[PDB]
Amino acid sequence: NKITPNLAEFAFSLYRQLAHQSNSTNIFFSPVSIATAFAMLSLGTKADTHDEILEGLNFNLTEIPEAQIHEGFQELLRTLNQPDSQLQLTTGNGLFLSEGLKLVDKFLEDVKKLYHSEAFTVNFGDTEEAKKQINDYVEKGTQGKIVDLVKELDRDTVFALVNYIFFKGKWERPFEVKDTEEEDFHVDQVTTVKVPMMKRLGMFNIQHCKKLSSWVLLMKYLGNATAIFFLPDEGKLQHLENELTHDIITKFLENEDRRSASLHLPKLSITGTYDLKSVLGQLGITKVFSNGADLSGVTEEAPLKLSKAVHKAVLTIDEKGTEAAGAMFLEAIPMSIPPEVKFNKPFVFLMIEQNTKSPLFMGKVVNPTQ
């Protein structure tokens, strides 16, 4: 995909933002779902308001034609929306607009048609009821996994955006549940907590990488996606985070070589919840959230700004991701000592969609039971 490098840069800019704020919180978000929602929104915007959004998603508008940006997203979307999908991704974006705004039909068509997204009209005159309808939409869309997403609305809200994603992947080569046991997780150099720890002896795409001073593990999911886990050497987490680049990730993805390892990887259930006005504001996207907003592609008559924009991402990592029996296979394990590679201290990860190479998720686990 032509927009993948931009999405990768966007992932890292957003990640580094969130990490710079604190190294004591788990991080999990979807560069793809956030960028898709904001590229979609830009269709309703003009001039500086429009350009700030696309530049804040790491597109250099002097270099990449807008049609290519949207064709990029639309290609990515139809990949993630395949009827077959074993990925089982649950994602949506909801726009909630004041009833009695005269809405531009082209915008509503672009949202639904091009971006296969949803737009609703609500009575923002009733703040509590609007919040309920927004939260109900998300709860319904996730058949119950995300509850009470929006906690507050400004009394002057006339436009809110909610973007949700939940993923529980199925490993192509799964862990056996019988092997999951409680183990130490080193939350710092002197402190441990107990966490459920999966383990398997297998042939892995795994390597210890000098440039990143980290172990780098790639594991495939059923459907079209790969999880990449980066385990920094003692004291090297900040180094790892600084050194990550699109080129480097591309190299790992091209490596198919496999070697024996006794892998220990925690079960995880992690969420990330982000105020996108706040977070994207630090990346330069500010006008669309301000009284200045040029949202004339959405409504021509009345003033409009985006008052509320929230992202919530939910990840489960477990042994199989399904109760179904998987395809039986056999990996040939050499008679030699496998390295023991334990994801039992803070680590960073990315999930990549295989067709486009896009960064579906990025995160950091500082403590599995936080």
Numbering used by the authors: 24 to 393
Wording from the paper:
α1-Antitrypsin is the most abundant antiprotease in the human circulation. It is also the archetypal member of the serpin (serine protease inhibitor) superfamily of proteins. A propensity to undergo stabilizing conformational change involving expansion of β-sheet A is utilized in the structural transitions required for protease inhibition.
We have now solved the highest resolution (1.8 Å) crystal structure of α1-antitrypsin. A new 1.8 Å resolution structure of α1-antitrypsin demonstrates structural variability within this site, with associated fluctuations in its upper and lower entrance grooves and ligand-binding characteristics around the innermost stable enclosed hydrophobic recess. The increased detail provides insight into the mechanism of β-sheet A expansion by delineating the hydration of a relatively hydrophobic environment around the highly conserved Trp194 residue, rendering the initial loop insertion site conformationally labile. These data nicely explain findings from previous tryptophan fluorescence studies of conformational change during polymerization. Occupancy of alternative rotameric orientations for Val216 and Ile340 became apparent during refinement. These are found on β-­strand s4C and in the hinge region between β-strand s5A and the reactive loop. Previous structures of native wild-­type α1-antitrypsin have indicated the presence of zero, one or two waters in this region. Fascinatingly, the intrinsic fluorescence spectrum of α1-antitrypsin reports the formation of both the intermediate and polymer during polymerization by a small blue shift and increased intensity attributable to Trp194. Moreover, comparison with 2.0 Å resolution structures characterizes variation in the conformational dynamics of the allosteric pocket in solution.
